[PDB]
């Protein structure tokens, strides 16, 4: 019977209560106080171009009606009284497909207090769409937006704020960090409206600033970029004479950057512009291409089948000499300006 | 018609403990924090402390930190700051505010100066 | 915290015209820039909360454009009540106002 006088009181709370009316319908504008504890910061996808995010969806707003005085100052209730009451229809302006989590009961809280304020808490896995421009990839930094309002009520009918101040309202736990190629550098929030024929609607804006993380990309992708762009070269340490251990040389090193430009691509969804890999993949094909073509001048002048054995014989031909030290003297200076240019 | 009315103005020598009261007569005093400002003559306004009136929670200025003391009477609906050691340097303009949003803040008090001697 | 700076420490014009002031913030503030006018002996007045919108009762002279750093107020015609002292506040974070700009003819 103890219980009965707290069942007594949610009772009276929801008779004569309509889910439909909004707090303060007329009367009043509603204020939303929301706020975000990222449990765990999803795994961006760059082939989607959105990103996962597991949040504590905090939403806090004062409601007359559901006022009361008893024993306790809060009541801690589960989801099922959540669904009897008004609460905002915040849904995720660029949210994908996002899923509420229901294991092992919904996983919502409803916290009503005595004077009426609400906290109104849920444990949400949204994929939110980030736009990223790929130019500076591999070495590229984002900032993924996640915007949510209210979806049927104009700035007249309910706005949203920040329960703290706008810069401690989005907290991520040290802990959770899913990101692997991506690392998440801080967190900007900022309010604002959007313009609808509907109306005119309130918006909670909050950045997620990201970087990538070069590490992955160099062993993958740099690193058998420049084995290929060295073993290239090497065939200029070979004699001359060996015609099928340079040709075997050069044809195999372009096949293997074509198969490296193919595997770079798959890596990121199709785009017009070309990012900064392909930059580094398209001269990193020049010099392989090119070291074909001053094999292809040595057989040019190669005027003698037979080799030096220790008559005449092959001598080592100068553009092989200066082949020799300007090809990888020209590659270096490329890489000084190429990872200066998009380091800094 | 929103009035924050603080306490007059008063002064005492260094050494003691001055209090100072922030009334609302408006709005609902427990719906929004009240702030409190300090301005020195021929300077910029520095923050001391909020005190949020229903949970009487309170945050500080890491300066003002233990040389303010923010604390509240709903049932009054006055907001107090409390001051201590006083010194030169204390000799300034208190204001009281609140904030409605995360942009603005309202309604400000009338203002209350401070001198030691 | 975030220290606000007022360019023009104090601004000389006649009435009418346009005079700007200008407000930077150190790092990020978003669209939280407000400013507020006080007068000598008075408490300050909201004039444009947020980066851009105006408080209510403000007369429609006063203009304020925002960036994400950068913040300024313009008004359009000065007047005699106009010439005041301006603070610009942040509330991004915790709150800290600029130094002050001074009017006067």
């Known amino acids: 019977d103890n219980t009965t006088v707290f069942t007594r009181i949610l009772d009276r709370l929801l008779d004569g209560y309509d889910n439909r009316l909004r707090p303060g319908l007329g009367e009043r504008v509603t204020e939303v106080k929301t706020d975000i504890f990222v449990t765990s910061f999803g795994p961006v996808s760059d082939h989607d171009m959105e990103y996962t995010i597991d949040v504590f969806f905090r939403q806090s707003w004062k409601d007359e009606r559901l006022k009361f005085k008893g024993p306790m100052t809060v009541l801690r209730l589960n989801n099922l009284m959540a669904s009897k009451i008004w609460t905002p229809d915040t849904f995720f302006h660029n949210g994908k497909k996002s899923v509420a989590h229901n294991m092992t009961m919904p996983n919502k809280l409803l916290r009503i207090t005595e004077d009426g304020t609400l906290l109104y808490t849920m444990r949400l896995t949204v994929r939110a769409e980030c736009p990223m421009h790929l130019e500076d990839f591999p070495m590229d930094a984002h900032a993924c937006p996640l915007k949510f309002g209210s979806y049927a009520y104009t700035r007249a009918e309910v706005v949203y704020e920040w329960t703290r101040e706008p810069a401690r309202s989005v907290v991520v736990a040290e802990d959770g960090s899913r990101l692997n190629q991506y690392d998440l550098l801080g967190q900007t929030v900022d309010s604002g409206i959007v313009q609808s024929s509907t109306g005119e609607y309130v918006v909670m804006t909050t950045h997620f600033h990201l970087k990538r993380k070069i590490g992955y990309f160099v062993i993958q992708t740099y690193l058998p970029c420049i084995m290929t762009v060295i073993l290239s070269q090497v065939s200029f340490w070979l004699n001359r004479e060996s015609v099928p251990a340079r040709t075997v040389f050069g044809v195999t090193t372009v096949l293997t950057m074509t198969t490296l430009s193919i595997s770079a691509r798959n890596s990121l969804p199709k785009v017009a512009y070309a990012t900064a890999m392909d930059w580094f993949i398209a001269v990193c094909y020049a010099f392989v291409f090119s070291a074909l073509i001053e094999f292809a001048t040595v057989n040019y002048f190669t005027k003698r089948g037979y080799a030096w054995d220790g008559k005449t014989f092959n001598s080592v031909s100068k553009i092989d000499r200066l082949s020799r030290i300007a090809f990888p003297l020209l590659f270096g200076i490329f890489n000084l300006v190429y990872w200066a240019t998009y380091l800094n | 018609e929103i009035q924050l009315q603080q306490s007059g103005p008063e002064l005492v020598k260094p050494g003691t403990s001055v209090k100072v009261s922030c009334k609302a007569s408006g709005y609902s005093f427990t719906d929004y924090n009240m702030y409190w400002v300090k301005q020195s003559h021929g300077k910029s306004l520095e923050w001391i402390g909020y005190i949020d009136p229903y949970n009487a929670d309170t945050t500080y200025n890491r300066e003002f930190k233990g040389k303010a003391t923010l604390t509240v009477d709903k049932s009054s609906s006055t907001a107090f700051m409390h001051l201590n050691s006083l010194t030169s340097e204390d000799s300034a303009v208190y204001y009281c505010a609140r904030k409605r949003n995360n942009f603005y803040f309202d309604y400000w008090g009338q203002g209350t100066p401070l001198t030691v001697s | 915290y975030i220290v606000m700076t007022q360019s023009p420490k104090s601004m000389s014009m006649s009435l009418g015209e346009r005079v700007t002031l200008s407000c930077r913030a150190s790092e990020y503030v978003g669209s939280y820039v407000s400013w507020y006018q006080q007068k000598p002996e008075q408490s300050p007045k909201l004039l444009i909360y947020?980066?851009?919108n105006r408080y209510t009762g403000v007369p429609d002279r006063f203009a304020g454009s925002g960036s994400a750093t950068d913040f300024t107020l313009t008004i359009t015609s000065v007047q005699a009540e106009d010439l005041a002292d301006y603070h610009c506040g942040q509330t991004y974070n915790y709150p800290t106002f600029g130094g002050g700009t001074k009017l006067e003819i």
């Open positions: 947020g980066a851009s």
